[PDB]
Each structure stands twice: as C-alpha cells, then as structure tokens.
Assembly symmetry: D2
Homo-oligomer: 500 residues x 4
C-alpha cells in the first residue's frame, strides 16, 4: 500500500489496459499480439515450485541469539566466542507428514530448524521438538515417508501402512511413545522444545573433540492440545500455528528459548553403557547435565512468505569451525541428502536467495547454473591449484582424526545394540495417571482401523516395554494381552528380525 504504482511488464514497458484483452472486434476472438496477457499468464503458471519431500507445512520468523554463558573451553565456534555476542537467526517450524495445505494441529513430530548467520558460515541446527526419532539407520527414512503419508492408491493416510511399519521397528517405540503422548500435539510452535536430537561434535582451540547434544527449552512453557481440542481448532483453522506465531510477533509478544548442551569427552563414547550415536536414545541428564549457553527470540515476521519461508533451505552439513558431526548413521545421511533435495527444489543457485545467503565472506568458485544473478565470480581464474593465489585452502581449521575400528561392511545394528525398551519404560514411569491414559487413548485412536495382527504386535512390544503400558494400550484398543501373545505364532511377519 501507500505509494501509487503504475503496472509495467518485466522489461519495464507500460501496460495500457489490465482489464480488457486485445480482440478482433468487441465480441471477437483473442489476438496473439496481446503481449501483456501472454507474459502475465505464462509467468502465472510457473509460480509453484515442488513442496519439501518432508515437513512441507511450516511457519518462519527472523530473530537473534545472545551468548549468556562461556563454553569456549569446549568449542572454538566464533558465534559463541564471548558473553553478550549477538547472532541473527532464521527459524522454520513445521509438521512432518502434512502437504502444503494440511492442518497445523495434527498429531505429529514438529520441525525446529535454525539458521545462524555466523562470521565463519551459516550454521543450520535442523532440529525436532523431540530428542529422539523413530529410526537409527537412514535405510528406513524413505519407508517412514511412505508409511506416515498417503497410500499409493487410496491417496489417504493408512493406519495399516503406518503401524505395520512402526510395529516391525521395536527401536521406534521411544518416539512412538513421545508422539502418542500429550506432547504429540503442541499448542503451537511457541509451547514446544527443540533438540538437535543427534549427537554432534565440538572442537576447541586445542583441537580436542567433545560429543554434544543441543536442547532448546521453551520460556513460554510446554502446552499441548488433546485430540478433541485439536479437531475443534482444525474445524475453524488449518493454519492455527501460523496464526498463533505471526499474531504473537505482530503484537510484540516475542517467543524465547534457552539453549543448553550436554558435553561428553570423545573417549567417554566407548565408556557409556548406551550407544551414544543411536538416534532412538537420549543421554541421561544425571550422566550429562544440561550446560546453559544462550537465549534466542523470534521478533520479525518475514515481509514475503514465499521468498523467505518457502525457499528457505536448511542442511545439517551447514557446520562452522568448532561445531561438527558424529557417526550417528541417520545424521551421516542427512549430511548429503538436504543439499541434494535443495538443488532440486530451489535450484543449484539457491544460496543467492537472501534467507539462505551467508552474511560473511564467500569464495566457493561455484560457476553458472540456471538463474545466475550475482556476478558468477566474474573473470577470476576458475581452477586450483593456480599461480594466482585464488581459492586457497584453510588448514588451520582441520579437525583431529576420528578413530575407526572394524572393516567396511553392513554391520547389523540389532547385533550391536538391542536395548529397545529401557528408555521408553523410563518415560512411561515419569508420566502421571492422566498422561498415561492420554498415551493409551491417543495410541488406540491413531491405530484406528489397522489390521488386528498389527494391534496385537504393538500390544506385545508395549508389554515387553512395561506390563502396565501393554495393558493400558490393549484395553483402550478393546483387546487383551493374552490374545496379543496368542497371535505371535501366526503373525504374518514371521521370519523378520524386528519381529520379537
């Protein structure tokens, strides 16, 4: 609004008429020489890009992060180098299974994706509102996509597809318990925590490695919706979380999180009794307590949703000196899969998009590609080694070596670690009676019409985790643990390693 604008073509030619097309007489046929119509409609049918293969529905905001505590003994990362140091951030929150138009207030994981515009590169912490995940090997990620999304023929969610998959992965019971708890539907993005979920690494100025987990704790408090409350909100508003977050920032009610880390010296990874790189497992806070780092707030709604939120590309591979990866098998796949997904979805030149662009010096020698806008590194020599001091590597940032034991092979995770249930059993025993009844009710509702052998399989897995959990679930499904047990002999998945 405000300053009057006069319509032009892309090339800046004045548009004469924006109400009438050019015709051979007043009621005659349309002419090809109606240039503005050709341009207006040709561009119109190319506005849509592919949605994200996962986490398609989302809301974004800009904000800042402030260091409140010193952790420079563990990490040389420049954004953490001093108390008081402020870094600008972009955050996209999301659901997982919904397409672009889907309801915000579904029972699902939420995405918690953070981009930090640092002096030594953008650092993407691509997190979830849960410290764990259903899977611990990336082999299973495309299968999870199909299981939680639409059947190839009914084009609807399928409790049978979803729960057949989940119940054949006993390692999944931890995240299944979390998403079937009261926290499976947060009351908008401001009332949930975030997590890196994976084990990452810190590297200090001494070139020492630590293993690390990020926790982002909501200063607005954990707050949830029951199935019924969510359904009532969806009936009015499929965009309930966008409404909530946009409205909050618009009225100056900026949401805040505190950032903590669990820090584990490199050598401790071979001393702990739990697999320290297993995404289905946390590190107990009694072994590795939270160390406070800083605080971030979201304080600015983007001017244009498509340019800043839809085109936003996060990559776990977007790391900076002093923050690096781990051999978590899931993290390891994400280190390449996001950059690849973004080359397809927003283009090879997607770092030209302002929300993705670095706010520090950049010298990649990336050349050409569709839609090159930014100079294309001009006439500079485009190869290395060269005799012209172009594109010089920076060895001072080299990480210490990472010790390997064992041959290259497909190593059976089930031989390495098969503690599927101790962590979910702990979580069940933390719950009060209401939360337990919610867990049982939410579970039986989600299984809905899944085939009976699948309901029996979940009840068996849940009983193994804790007899009271198996009972509450079996009861809420109107079944018995005895029938669940009797069904194992004829379970059609017989012969299959995740079938216990």
């Amino acid at each position: 609004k405000c300053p009057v604008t006069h319509l032009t073509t892309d090339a800046g030619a004045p548009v004469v008429d924006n109400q009438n097309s050019m015709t051979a007489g007043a009621r005659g046929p349309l002419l090809a020489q109606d240039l503005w119509l050709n341009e207006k409609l040709g561009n119109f049918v190319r506005e849509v890009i592919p949605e994200r293969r996962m986490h398609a529905k989302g809301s974004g905001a800009f904000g800042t992060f402030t260091v409140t505590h010193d952790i420079t003994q563990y990490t040389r990362a420049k954004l953490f180098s001093e108390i008081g140091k402020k870094t600008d951030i972009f955050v996209r929150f999301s659901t997982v299974a919904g397409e672009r138009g889907a309801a915000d207030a579904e029972r699902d994981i939420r995405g918690f994706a953070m981009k930090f515009y640092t002096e030594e590169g953008n650092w993407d912490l691509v997190g979830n509102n849960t410290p764990v995940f259903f899977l611990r090997d990336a082999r299973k990620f495309p299968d999870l996509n199909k299981a939680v999304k639409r059947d190839p023929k009914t084009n609807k969610r399928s409790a049978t597809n979803n729960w057949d998959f989940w119940t054949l992965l006993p390692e999944a019971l931890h995240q299944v318990t979390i998403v079937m708890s009261d926290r499976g539907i947060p009351d908008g993005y401001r009332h949930m925590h975030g997590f890196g979920s994976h084990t990452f690494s810190f590297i200090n100025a001494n070139n020492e490695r630590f293993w690390v987990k990020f926790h982002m704790r909501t200063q607005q408090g954990i707050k949830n919706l029951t199935d019924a409350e969510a359904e009532a909100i969806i009936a009015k508003d499929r965009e309930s979380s966008q409404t909530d977050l946009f409205d909050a920032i618009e009225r100056g009610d900026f949401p805040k999180w505190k950032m903590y880390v669990q820090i584990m010296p490199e050598l401790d990874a071979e001393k702990v009794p739990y697999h320290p790189f297993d995404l289905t497992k946390v590190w107990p806070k009694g072994d590795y307590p939270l160390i406070e780092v800083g605080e971030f707030e979201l304080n600015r709604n983007p001017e244009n949703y498509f340019q800043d939120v839809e085109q936003a590309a996060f990559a776990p591979s977007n790391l900076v000196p002093g923050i690096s990866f781990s051999p978590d098998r899931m993290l390891q796949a994400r280190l390449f899969n996001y950059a690849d997904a973004a080359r397809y979805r927003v283009g090879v030149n997607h770092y030209q998009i302002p929300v993705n662009a670095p706010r520090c010096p950049v010298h990649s020698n990336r050349r050409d590609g569709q839609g090159r806008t930014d100079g294309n590194y001009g006439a500079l020599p485009h190869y290395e080694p060269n005799s012209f001091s172009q594109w010089q590597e920076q060895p001072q940032y080299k990480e210490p070596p990472l010790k390997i034991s064992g041959a290259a092979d497909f190593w059976d995770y089930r031989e390495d670690d098969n503690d599927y249930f101790s962590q979910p059993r702990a979580l069940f025993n933390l719950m009060n009676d209401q939360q337990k009844q919610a867990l049982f009710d939410n579970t039986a509702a989600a299984m809905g019409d899944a085939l009976d052998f699948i309901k029996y399989r979940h009840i068996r897995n849940c009983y193994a985790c804790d007899p009271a959990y198996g009972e509450g679930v079996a009861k809420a499904l109107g079944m018995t643990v005895a029938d669940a047990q009797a069904a194992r002999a004829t379970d059609p998945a017989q012969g299959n390693p995740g079938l216990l």
Copy 2:
C-alpha cells in the same frame, strides 16, 4: 501384496541389506560406496512435482460415456455418431483455492474435468460445478488466484484481499451468489452438477456452426453441507470427498451424470439480448432448452493416484472434429494457458503418461524433450513439406470461416455489456426463504473481518441487484443499507470503472 518381491536397484542389481547402511566399523562413519543408499535417497528427494497453480486438491476416476440420443444433425463428432456408442473417460474433480493438503469440504467452486478417449483425439471438457464464473476477461484470472489464496505476508486466506477484488467486479456477483448459496459446499463430488460453463461450437457434416453449452446433471441428486456440517466433517477428515468417491466406487455404487446441450444457430448470437459469450451469464432454458445426448458413470478407482490423478493434464484446447471453441474471452486464454501450465508441471513429454495418452492414431512429429521413452518417431523424416508422404495435413476437417466486425483493439467490456445484476436477481428470486437466509449467513461469514468499506460496497452491489438481497446481507453483517449508501462518497476505490 501376494507375489513375494526381491528388492533391486533401478538397474536390476540385487540389494543385499535394506536395514543397515555401509559403515567403517559398526559404530563408524557412513561410506560413499553404499550405492543403494545414494540411489534410494537421491530418487526419494525428486518424487514431488509442482502442484497445479489452480485446483491443486482433487480426486479422479475412470468410467464410460454412452450416447442415448441422436444429435448428429448438429455435430459430426465421432464419439456422438451413433446411439449406443460407448467412449472411455477419465474425470478429475477438485476444489479451486486449496493447496495439495487443504480440506475437501471448503466453500469454493468445484472442478469437473472430463477426458474422452475418442477415435479422433482426446476431448477435454474442463468444467466447473457452476454454469458461470466470477470473470469474463482472462486479464483478471491471476488476480483471482491471489485474491482467493494466501496473502503474500500472512500466508493465510484474506477476506480483505478476496472481497476487495470481488466487490470491484460487479460482473462477479452472479458466481459470488452461487458460491455463497447452499451449493457453495456440495456433499462430495457425486451430489453436484458439472458444466462446460463457456459457450463452445458444434460443426455438422454440412460444415454448419452452432453455439453450444454442456450441462452434466447428477443422477444422485443435488446435496449440500451447511458451514457447520462442513466444519464438523473437516475436524475428522480433510480428504472427505476422496473418501466419499473412492468408497462409493469400491462398493460398486457407481455415480452417474446425464449430459445435455443447449444449441444456438450461429446467427442467433447477434439476435439474443444477452452477450452469448459472457462467462458471467447463462442462456435461459426457456430460450434454449436442454437437449439430452448421453450418460456417463465413474466405475474404476485408479491403481496409482500419482500416475493417473496427479499427472492428469486437461486442456480446453483438446477438441475434436465437430466440437470447437467460441470467442468467449476467458475460453480463448485457456486455449493456450493449460498446455503451457502442463509443459512446466508434468513435462513437454506428458502425453507419454497413460492417463493423458490418446487411444487413436497419433502423428505429431513432436521430437526429443526430457524423458523421451516412446520411440521419438524413430528415423522418419522430421520436416514438412517433404517428398516422402510424412505428416500430411487433413483439410476435410476445416471449419467454416468466423465473421469478425471491428478493429483489433482493447475493447472495453463495460461499454459492450453492463447487465451485471439481472441474472443474479433471477437466481435470488428462485431461492426459498431458507436458501435466502443461507445466502445471507454464508455471505456475512465469508466476509468475516474484511474492512468496513468493502462490506459497504458488497451491500450496495447486492441492493442494486435486489433490495431484499442488499437488506438480508446488510443485516447478517450487522450493518444498514443507509450506511452502505453513505459510505460510497468516501469509498477509497473512487475513480475506478467497477465502482458503481
């Protein structure tokens, strides 16, 4: 299900392990030589194509059309040539404003897109569940897209954007009245009519032209949902119309429509008192009664939604001998905009997709393009004229000339026809008291929080159509027609041709 399948790569190499990735020791980093993971994940992030720029949410089915009546005196079209002749069809139903994930049971137009696999080409009748539309010049179609979709900043529907646009187009009141009536929310695709909406042409074996309108009348009966009933269905099911249609076909309860035509001899177009090519106007049935043609049923759910429904491309330009276009200015733009939209969305080689492919001989000499699969017309000479009898034109199908009067220019539609209100006034006076109260209630709900000057503008336009319509709307908005009238002097759109 049924025959056991053994996992291979695209190239047919056996996959050894589909549960574990290849690692440097059991808890070591991931190896690049894990070929199956690279392939599985690289293909995974390229499954999604752009949604349709309009009518993104939809349901599809296969079926057949049977001629029941003789109209060969009006049309030489081969699918109509004999009573009893059966043609196979594909139909996609849709909403308009929803993205891929959006609720089915919104207040919106529904799409009614038909593909007839004819012996002289696929005939697409790309229709709506309404005989008219909001607009009569394609200039305004991209603007309607933005008005009924998401604000560029809030990323939500905007009553202000939507109703500012609508109230500045008095010609739109006809379709606004239809979509705000009880029929703005059909109880699924089986309980709505379809229409070509536009005036088309028939050409008979004598090379005579008729102007024609297609009506497809539901044999299951008009059936609707109130705002409250729709909201309750959405709370359970965003896919309510897919559920309804898929379930009906799956239980053998095949939905049927009867097809009729209004036929107008060419010369009558200059004798009627209404603009006969104006998409905001019908032809009164008293002047041009319905002539029965045939009956179609939908009787087969596609095996794969993506391959048959999501990749389906309709084009109003997909016409056959004996069925052709008119100078309707809206139809005229669609004659090029759909083929162009599909080149971007499903590729230049989209006619290789089975649902789009013709079931008759095809010799286009279309060469190359990404993903060419079908022979590419092999080694045949690829130019015309040639000395080799390749690609010979077919003059026997030539249409009679179309008379033009007037210069090429931007002809102001408002000078040519400005009867905005007589047809909506007729429709209002057909309604019984309940339907009228629904029209008023639905209208005030849809305007929701639109700025007051916009509510005043709709009330003025509605009063001009019929004093009782203006009153019922003003009342349901908690306003008065007097205030509406007083606001015209300061209306901020002053200086603007659609502001009456």
Copy 3:
C-alpha cells in the same frame, strides 16, 4: 587474480583441504561426511542449462547508441526523443544451425540481437544479417529447424533433408540466394549488416501509425570468406568470430553501425504492389529510402560469458511506447515464442539476471517462481483491481485501433501473394560475374549429395527466377536445365502446392 582468496563453502564455512578427500585410512574408501566434496561435485553437475533451440553459438558485447537525427514526428519512443541522447545496449551475434561447440565460420544466416535499456522498458530488436528470411508463416519454423540441423538417425547435417524442404518452398529462394551468395559467410560479426527484417510500427505523439523497417549498416565494410577461406579458418579455430570480436574490443578498435529506417504511412500498406508484411520481401529503397536515426558502438567485453551472454534472453515482444509490431505472420509468432523459450531455458525469474533486467522502474506484480531473489514485491497487495492504488494501468500509451478485413480463417498465403522470384531476380542481376559464379559454386557445394530429383527441383525454381541463374546452378551441379525440366513429370512431391 590479485587479492588472495580463501576457499569457502556456499554457506561461507572454511574449506580445510581442496587436494585430498576424506578417507577411512590413507588407502581406504571415501566417507560420506566429506561435505566439501559432496557440495563441490553436486553443484558441478548442475552448471549446464539447455542451449538455445536456435542460434545456440554466439558472441556478446556491451556498447552505446547515440541519436544523430530527429525522427520524433514519426515516433514518440523515448530513446529517440533528442539528438545526442545516449542509450546503453547489449548485442548478441550468432550463427543459426550450429550447437554450442559448432564452428563460427559456417555458411549460415547470422543473428544480430540488440537490447536497448530505455527509460520506458528494454527494447529488443532481434535481427539477422539479412533483410528477409526463408519463410513467411511460422507454421514452417520448427520444420526449418529440423531441415538445417541434424538428421534424427545420422545425427549429421543432411543436404537431402535441407534441400527437399527449401526447394518445396519457392518463397524461400530469396533467402537461399542471399545465404548461397558471398555474404553467406561474413568475415566475423563486425563486417556484416543487421536488419529487423520484419515490418514493425512507429506511433507518434499524435497517435498516428507508420510501418517501419530497421537497417543497421556496418561502418567496418561488408567483408566475406569463400568456402575455402572459411574451411582453413575452421581447421585452426571453431571460435574465429569470438576471437575477432573480443580481440577488436580488447585493443580499443570498437565496431560501429549506423541505424536507418524505411517509413511507410499506415494507408500505404494497401497501396503497394508487394505484400508489405511478407518476410520473404523487402521494400525497394527507391519507394522508401533509408532515413538516418543514430549510431551504436560495441566497446565492452562482458566480465563473465555465462552470466551476460549465455543467459541473455531477447524477445521481439520487448517493445516500448512509439515502437510496436505488424501483422507479419512470422513476427506475430515470435511475439510469444521467445518469452516462452526463455521461461524454459533461463527460468521464469530470468529478468533478475543483470543483462536481462530493465534499467527503469518495474512494477509487474510477477510473484514467486524458482530462485526468487529480489524481494518478490514484498507484502504489497498482489491483485487488481484494489482499493490501494497498486498496479494502475497506463492508458496514455494506448495505440490507435488496427483495421481488419476478412473472417478468422486459415488464409492460403499462395492465393494472397505468389511473387516468389521478382526480388531474387533483381538481386541476381545486381551481382557482378564473380559474385554470380560464387552463387553457383556455393549452391552446388551446399546441395552436395542431395538426391537428384531435389537438384532438378532447385534448377527449375532458379530458371523460373532467371534463365541465367538456372543455367549457372545446373552447370555447377554438372546437370542440364532440360533434364531438370524432364524430371518434373515424375517429381515425387507431385500433388503439393509449393511444387511449381
């Protein structure tokens, strides 16, 4: 060169090693966590975009245009408004049939594409080094593409495909004569003229229309290569024209053209004895003498060929107030085909590319699309009509109406005008004996191994144009006009309108 650069990722993270990949031991397998390699190679395989479907091989330069003469009585175009007024330009020269790597010094038309960065929009004059073309209806343009390019099976140029097509278009003899003359191989882009070829329109401040032809005459002089001289240059340099033009600008030897116009009052188009919109015909200079307008020089080599030359998009539709189109049937197709070609080749957001961007105000309300970088018109309302003074049309630039006579139909060009030979006969009689012998020799060489019936057909067409032309061609082919004449009875194209 000069300032030392330190290699980073796109996200600005330092790169540790640019010589060694990350491996599991010194002679072990490659790790997926080698982030720089993934990024470097993933981006590398996306550098290439599609070449132009026509005129793929080219050279570009920046320059300026200066008005030297007053023609404001004929055109209100702002770049021409005063003597001395300077406009910045980009020019791309090209061959036509060569792919990206093909030789510069082939016997072909050359492209002469001009972009003028004007205060009322970019004006593209997309010209050739010839005043005419082979065709006069766009129906035949894709066929010309196939005929002059590679056979679908041999993947080589085919004299049979090329000359079968050409000899079945008698209207083509004019351009065939030009491209087979000594001027079919200019000695680089600096020693050739340019032409708009088509009839365009001027509109003056009085809203009067003139028909207009643009001539751009080389101030370096017409200079050509024989077949033998060209072949010798190709043996050393496939990039001979890039070498020539780049080297000339680099040493300050800036090439200059003078711009002239032929001006014809609107009404004269119905008074001339030649079809004034027929691209196979010029306007004789005796009827419409050249009027001088200005002078342009190319004086700056682009810093980056891909960003400025390969991504350059010209469109005949890029017109400005006071310069517009004509009903030339070929021009009429180009008015839409280039903008469409560019949406595919450089993207819907290709006007963000600096060489394509306007240097004047732009308000198109074009939204979104892949790779949106420039603000996306932020939060401004995105529909018209609106109550907020956004996107207001500009009626002061409206053209006078264009008179139409006749029905909409496929009008046979051969019924309308069939003077195939008078203009080529004039051109043949302008030639001196050497140029004539060149025309005959060049023709027989180009026909090479074309089937005999095709050589006979060219000789017949050439004899009809002028008995001496038919003789010289028949002789250089080692045939006789008598045999050519005897072959017409059995010509396999019998039954075909371009077969005389």
Copy 4:
C-alpha cells in the same frame, strides 16, 4: 518414409493446415485460437536438454559381447558364467572437453562407455581410451573441467589455464604424456583401445575378492592422426568420428574389441611397490599379465540419436554380483556423481528410457517423479519392513568385509605415494624416435601461448621424468632446460605442494 502419415496433435486431433496460421483476414494479425501453432511451437522450444557436463560430444551403437574364456574361479558374475554366453550391449564413445557441436578430431582423451544388459542388472563399464588419468583424487575433477574447457571471460580454450593446472600436478605427467603422444588423436573410435582405468574388484562364488583391471583391445589396430591430418579433417567435418563409425556399421563392417583382465588377489594390494588404487598408475603386465575373457562387436546404428545416444546414462555404480568397486579415490566419487548428474540431465525417471532400462526383473519401489509412465509399482505397499513379502533384501550377494587401517582424516596423497615419473619415464623409453618427436611437437603446439613460467615448469617436470624428454620439449618450445631451472626460484606458485 513409406507408409503415408496424416498429421495430428499430441492428443490425436487431425491438423487441418500445416502451411498457414489462423489470422483475422488474409493480411491480419495472428489469433490465439490457432491451437496447432501454440502446441507445435510450445513443444519445439522444449526439445533441448542440458548437454553432459563432461564428454558432451559422442557417438553410440548397439552390439553383443560373447564369453570366449572361463574366469568363473575369479568372478560369479552371471554374464561371464559360461563360454559362448552372449550379452547385448550399448556403447557411447566421446571426446571430453568439446561441447555438443565441437570437432570430433581434437587432441583429447576419448570416452569408451559400455552398458551390459545382464540377467542380474545393467553393468556399466564407463571407460577411457587410456589406462590412467590426470588425477588421483576427485577434489581436482571440477578444476580439470574448467582448465580444459572455456575461460570464464574469453569463452575460449586457454593454454594458460590448462597448463598452469596440469604443471602444478606432477602426478598428471603420465596422462599428459599419453594425450600429447600420437595416440592423443585416434583415427576414429574403431582404432583406439578402451580401459576401465580404475582398479575394480571381482568376487567369486567362494566369497573371495580379487582386484581387477579391464583392457578392451581394438581388433582394427591402433591408428592415429597427426595435428595436421586432424586439422584437415576438421576443415571438412566436425562429425568425422560419427561419420566413420555410422558408415562402418551401415556397410556391415562391424568393429570388434577383445576384453582382457589383470587379476590381483586381495592381499597382493599390500605387497606391490606401486599404489594399486592410484589412477595415475598402471599395473605392469610382467607382474599381472592380461587374461582373455571375451569379444564384443558393435553391429546396429540406433534408429533415433536423441532417444538412444543423447539420453544414455552410464554410472560406475551400475555394478552386478561378482563385479564391484575399489578404494581408488577417483572411482569412489564417480560411484555417486554420475547417478546425480543423470537425475538433473535426463530426470529422476531416466531408467524408463529404453537404452537405460534393465532387461531383467526390477523391484526398486522408486515412486513418482516427473514423467512417470510405467505403472509406478501400482498399488503395492510402498514401505519395508512390511507384513506382505514386498521388497525383500537378498543377503546371498553380500561381499566379504573390506579391511580398513587408519583413522578417518584428509590423508595427504603426496605423503602416501610420490612416484610421479617412473611410469611416464618407462612410456617415453618405449617410444621410437618419430613418436618422441611427435610427443615434443604436440606438447609445444598444445602449450601454444601459455605464460613462460608455465612452459618452464613443464620442462622442469619433464626433465625430472627423463633428461631427454625435458630436452626435446624445451627445444620444441624454443627454450633451454637451464632457463627452466633458473626460473624455479621466482616461479609464482612458490609455497605449493605440487611445485617440485
């Protein structure tokens, strides 16, 4: 040719006129309702896909491979299982640096890409006409692309860019010597050998590993062109190798190669004095003599070049049971980079293209993607694990583990192996005096105008390889080894590990 064809649209509608466009009167403007023109031209501008980022210029043929010898003790690969067993193949030959249009007879490596349509998957042996390459780590491959292709500003080959890069890689001297020898320009694809170049692996039925090198030896004899002979061929024909190969097959003169292998037991890789996975090094035939396997002939020209040759996608990752990879660092990158390059260039669904499609059972569960044609695995469950025997892994094909020693790190190749010159010195001493003089002449011609410090650097590296080689090169450049030696002190690349 032969059967008369009648022109239709893609949808199979008859085309009335293919010579005239639809106009408002005979000399009037073009109408938008000319559907055939819209379709014909819209499809026309989408025929071109991106060329290959490397090896863009090529020729293809179909053929067969016959086993002549038993090697089943080394490999369980099914195509080798019996003497007499015939496998169908596709082969694409190429240059490396040329774009689509570039000359065939340039001084360059040639590509020798083989696809074997095997009963357990397509096996791609993506080879070159040389047993080695310039590089031994993939870090340097994009840099080699830029060095051997066009300068970002001159858009021409640059001897300075090319030789600056090459002379700073002493490991490159082996391949530099080969490509500067008489064999740098083979007399077409039929007179050159092929090689896998890399060390691969065989796995036998006992689950034992061997390291292996493939040699494909021409039965038509090594035959070459001098610089002068090549230049003379280019002056006539940029497509000389396509002409040669197509013509040979067309006249029944089918070219044949014999396939041999060098076989090295796994444990020998730690016993040899040369790095056995270093692409700049061969295995001496005295240590590992050639073992004969079979013979292949190319006997069928494809019907359509674009469908079969341009869309052909090879991937080193396309391996079958009994043939696998090695830790060669270059091979390791190609294992992912080709499948990724093809997803961009020919689409995610490129295995639908007949030349790429497997000729054995395929069950990948790859879903959707643009242009899905083939059923999309219909309604089958689309996740694993499932209770429905879909997508079952095949463990019988598991390879033995691969022993790793050392930490994950960037291991400096120059510390591991720095024998740059012994193999090129051997090759120089195999040459007769003519071949030596050719090597010197070809080298000085290729360095052309490269800056002097670069010529000095090549002479130094060549002298180190063999004093006679340094002398012959220095002399042919008109320089002395003494000046070369004196220049090292001021060499501008001082401080750089490949500068000796």
